[PDB]
Amino acid sequence: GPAVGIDLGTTYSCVGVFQHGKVEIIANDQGNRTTPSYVAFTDTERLIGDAAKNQVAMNPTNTVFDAKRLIGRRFDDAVVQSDMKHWPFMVVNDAGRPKVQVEYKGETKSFYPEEVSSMVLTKMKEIAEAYLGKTVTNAVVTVPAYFNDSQRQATKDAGTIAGLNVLRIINEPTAAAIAYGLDKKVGAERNVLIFDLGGGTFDVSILTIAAGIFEVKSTAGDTHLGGEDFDNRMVNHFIAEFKRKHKKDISENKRAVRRLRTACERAKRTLSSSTQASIEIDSLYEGIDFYTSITRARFEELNADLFRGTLDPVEKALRDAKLDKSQIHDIVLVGGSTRIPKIQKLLQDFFNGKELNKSINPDEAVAYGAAVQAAILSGDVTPLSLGIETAGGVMTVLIKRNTTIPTKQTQTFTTYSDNQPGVLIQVYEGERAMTKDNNLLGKFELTGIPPAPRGVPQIEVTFDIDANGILNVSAVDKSTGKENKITITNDKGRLSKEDIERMVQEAEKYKAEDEKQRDKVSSKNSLESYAFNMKAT
Ligand code: NA
């Protein structure tokens, strides 16, 4: 049977299947295409999904949510320590691992974050099985791009516990791009910004896509910004309005606040499609009916700081990606909060009128991409950056990856040491800062450099790639015209698509460490006479 794509979200989860040439997002028992990531433990039963969320007020201690925040993390993590304070449920330390502790059937029980996530995955698997009419085993599960190897493995383990064979763990921004088919664009590399504003988290991701290959250039956002925050601003405003009108604070009554919050969430949805919404609550407090209205403009004023603040992570991501806003080719909206008209206007105005990709339901786009990838697994540009080793074993790129062929790139280099007799030209392929982490393709020596102080001799290195992809690397001593060259054959099938993806992924994993290595050397054009990788120490 077909594999399924699952968006394991912090607040809500979504499951989709690619069948008959089309992705179908699967509705649950109550007809909802999204299922709350909530598990509830009671004296009589365990509830997953809408049932768990509906009874949260009655059983807060035994209702678990935000397990994604704890997944793949140590208990001593500061995020876990700060996050634990907000949650009613208890978090405990077992062998350096956080666990949720709850009372189920009168017995204290402890579950690893992956175990709670496995229960949400079990419900999504059952939702898929009811729709398909067949057992579902294979799945593609999505995770935030910033997730580390531990967080990804823990998410895979949650699927394994649920009985799912997790074919691959893919980034949520990449899944959204796959849903819009940005990989199938016939032109040269494209820079894509994924603006993801969910119920509880805000994620901005910049990706570069060429030849079906995705690279995460930058990530930015707020882990604590979401639609619920917009609802809270409306609730606080209404509490103030009631207090001004009736001289009473409804904050004391928990149910009254819950009823107001429910009305505010409905009003916010109405405000996305209409310019005004009505709040009608009978007997909100002390028998006083609350009948009032809110304009879209008032809602925008209440959330003005939060809405404008979304641009700040966009600016940071662009700086980290070393890209100007003009260089973004595609913008994708993900998450329900992206429906808000003010958010769309602010992003479009920031991008100078650029159209936004919002045709796919923002709540379902990540699951849609996961479903497309699951089906693919179920059934001329340069592949890698090309460069030479500079002093310190550093990779200096002459031809960037995704460069159209044929191409010729020339750079000038100098000696690192005084009276250096020769330079060793070492050709490497890869996206890592250091040649040790890249692949050596060939080496040649240019000798007879006239004795001179360091930084004075000029050596022009040229990389020439023909249409067939054969690489010719040449070095000329500018003082004498003396030259040496190597021809590197293009071996067919040497590199698979997966091989390129692994090398790009490795660069994403070590980007912070790699940048520090780049900053270490004062000169970027200095060549030594030896191979740094073969040096002792
Ligand atoms: Na999401």
Q: Is the dihedral of CA 13, 19, 21, 26 positive or negative?
A: negative
What burial class does residue 522 get, using C-beta atoms within 10 Å of its C-beta: 0-12 exposed, 13-18 middle, 19+ buried? exposed
Cα of 76 from ligand 1 centre, angstroms: 26
Q: Which residues pair with 48 in a beta bridge?
A: 39
How far is ligand 1, taken at its centre, from the CA of residue 84, in Å?
A: 21
- Is residue 286 domain-shared with residue 395, that is, in the same domain? no
Q: Who contacts 374 (Cβ-Cβ below 8 Å, separation ≥6)?
A: 2, 3, 4, 5, 17, 18, 138, 139, 140, 167
Helices (H), 200-302: 227-246, 254-273, 296-302
Please give the Cα distance from 112 to 164 (Å, whole number). Answer: 18
Q: Are 76 and 82 a contacting pair, CB within 8 Å?
A: no
**Best CA proximity match to 132, nearest among 276, 26, 267, 239:** 26
Distance 460 CA to ligand 1 centre (A): 49
Number of H helices and E strands in the chain, helices first, is 15, 27
**Which of 526, 524, 520 is CA-nearest to residue 424?**
526
361: CA distance to ligand 1 center in Å? 12
> Tokens standing for 470?
């054969």
269 is in an annotated binding site: yes
Q: Are residues 288 and 432 in the same domain?
A: no
38 carries a ligand binding annotation: no
Q: Is 249 a known active-site residue? A: no
Based on the fold, state whether residues 514 and 395 are members of the same structural domain.
yes
68 is catalytic: yes
Residues 418 and 514 in one domain: yes
Q: Is the Cβ–Cβ distance between 360 and 368 less than 8 Å? A: yes
Residue 368 zone, left/alpha/beta (φ > 0; ψ -120 to 50; rest): alpha
The reply, when asked if residue 11 is annotated as ligand binding, is yes
The sheet that has 190-197: what strands, in order across it? Answer: 213-222, 202-210, 190-197, 330-334
Q: Which helix (H) or strand (E) holds 512?
A: helix 511-520
Strands 213-222 and 483-488: unpaired
Instruction: Give residues with Cβ within 8 angstroms of 121, minimum separation 6.
Output: 6, 8, 13, 139, 141, 158, 159, 161, 162, 164
**Residue 338 is labelled as binding a ligand:** yes
Q: How far is the CA of 142 from the centre of ligand 1 (A)?
A: 9
Q: Per the annotation, does 275 bind a ligand?
A: no
295 has binding-site annotation: no
Distance, CA of 363 to CA of 341 (rounded, Å): 16
Q: Catalytic one among 50, 83, 172, 183?
A: 172
Assess whether 295 and 397 both reside in one domain: no
Pairing of strands 138-143, 165-171: parallel
Contact criterion met (CB below 8 Å) for 318 and 192:
no
Same-domain pairing of 391 and 508: yes
Statement to judge: residues 513 and 399 lie in one domain:
yes
297 and 389, same domain (yes or no): no
The answer to whether the annotation marks 404 as part of a ligand binding site is: no
Q: How many angstroms separate the alpha carbon of residue 344 from the centre of ligand 1?
A: 17
Following CA atoms 276, 279, 280, 283 in sequence, which dihedral angle do they give, to the nearest 10 degrees? -160
Resolution in A: 1.8
Query: Alpha-carbon distance 360 to 34, whole Å?
Result: 14
Beta strands in 126-212 (DSSP E): 138-143, 165-171, 190-197, 202-210
CATH number, domain containing residue 234: 3.90.640.10
Q: How far is residue 204's CA from residue 310's CA, in Å, rounded to a whole number?
A: 9
Q: What CATH code is carried by the domain that includes residue 483? A: 2.60.34.10
Task: State yes or no: is 43 an active-site residue.
Answer: no
7 is catalytic: yes
User: Phi and psi of 209, rounded to 5°?
Assistant: -125, 125
Taking the C-alpha atoms of residue 433 and residue 127, their distance in angstroms, rounded to an integer, is 45
Tokens 């009372």 map to which residue?
Answer: 103
Q: How far apart are CA 155 and CA 113, in angstroms?
A: 9
User: From ligand 1's centre to the CA of 391, what distance in Å?
Assistant: 44
**The domain containing residue 243 runs over which residues?**
227-301
Selecting among 68, 123, 125, 342, the annotated active-site residue is 68
Q: Residues 177, 179, 180, 186: is their CA dihedral positive or negative?
A: positive
Whether residue 9 is annotated as binding a ligand: the answer is yes
Residues 294, 408, single domain; the answer is no
The answer on 284 and 387 residing in a single domain is: no
Distances from the Cα of 226 to the Cαs of 251, 275, 299, 301, 386, in angstroms? Answer: 22, 21, 15, 16, 42
Measure 43 CA to ligand 1 centroid, in angstroms. 32
Q: Which of 7, 83, 389, 477 is catalytic?
A: 7
DSSP letter for each residue of 22-75: EEEEPP-TTS-SSEE--EEE-SS-EEETHHHHHTTTT-STTEE--HHHHTT--T
Same domain for 276 and 396: no
Instruction: Tell whether 275 and 401 lie within a shared domain.
Output: no
Q: Which of 114, 189, 196, 437 is catalytic?
A: 196
